[PDB]
Design a binder for this molecule. Structure first.
Ligand SMILES: Nc1ncnc2c1ncn2[C@@H]1O[C@H](CO)[C@@H](O)[C@H]1OP(=O)(O)O
Length: 210
């Protein structure tokens, strides 16, 4: 038996719609913001970010736990064999999004996982060098878009990098108020919105087979 391409939480029709709509409003707003227009040189008339992030999920949004490549990825067998994964397979979850973000490479939403959902977060031996210093599960995100040259993999790395700055106290003071939250400028083309109300999205834990 081969494993899926990857396991993860796949958001319902309605919830994918809410998050997608919310990510796309952020993009028109960030692209229209004075603070962003000024720093556009450190990013790349106005730039239309919805177009910039041309490579979008075409259907339902998802939050990846463990990329398996059908069993070719390190720790895939390990992960899939866990009681918690088999038990959770096909179960419903509510995910909490705390922030939307943008970099020159990706646009995503930061997921904050409950301890129960953390039981489903992988515990691999090959761990990212930007992951260290952050709790397990900090990589948890939903990808909203990518630049032409970029793989959706980059979104997770982009998120860790951004939070590696937050833990360093390197976010600074907010440079704007969008209707949903406070806008931060991390430098190096990076931007974070901390949501006033975290949005709850519904999702099913299952496997995706390409
Ligand atoms: N090398 C890798 N490590 C972890 N996840 C990967 C990966 N390569 C691709 N992916 C994930 O597999 C999917 C490919 O269809 C992408 O959505 C991406 O998830 P992501 O959106 O969370 O970044």
């Amino acid at each position: 038996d081969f494993l899926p391409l990857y396991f993860g939480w796949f958001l319902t029709k309605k919830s994918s719609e809410t998050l997608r709509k919310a990510g796309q409003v952020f993009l028109e707003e960030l692209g229209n913001h004075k603070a962003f227009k000024k720093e556009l040189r450190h990013f790349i008339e106005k730039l239309e970010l919805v177009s910039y992030f041309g490579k979008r999920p075409p259907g339902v949004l998802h939050c990846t736990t463990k990329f398996c490549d059908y069993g070719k990825a390190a720790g895939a067998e390990e992960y899939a064999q866990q009681e918690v994964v088999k038990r959770s397979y096909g179960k419903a979850f509510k995910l909490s999004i705390s922030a939307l973000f943008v970099t020159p490479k990706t646009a995503g939403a930061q997921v904050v996982l409950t301890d129960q959902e953390l039981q489903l977060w992988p515990s691999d031996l090959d761990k990212p060098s930007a992951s260290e210093g952050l709790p397990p599960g900090s990589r948890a995100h939903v990808t909203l878009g990518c630049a032409a040259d970029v793989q959706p993999v980059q979104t997770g790395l982009d998120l860790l990098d951004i939070l590696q700055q937050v833990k360093g106290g390197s976010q600074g003071e907010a440079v704007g108020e969008l209707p949903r939250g406070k806008l931060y400028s991390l430098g190096k083309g990076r931007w974070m919105l901390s949501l006033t109300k975290k949005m709850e999205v519904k999702a099913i834990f299952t496997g995706y087979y390409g």
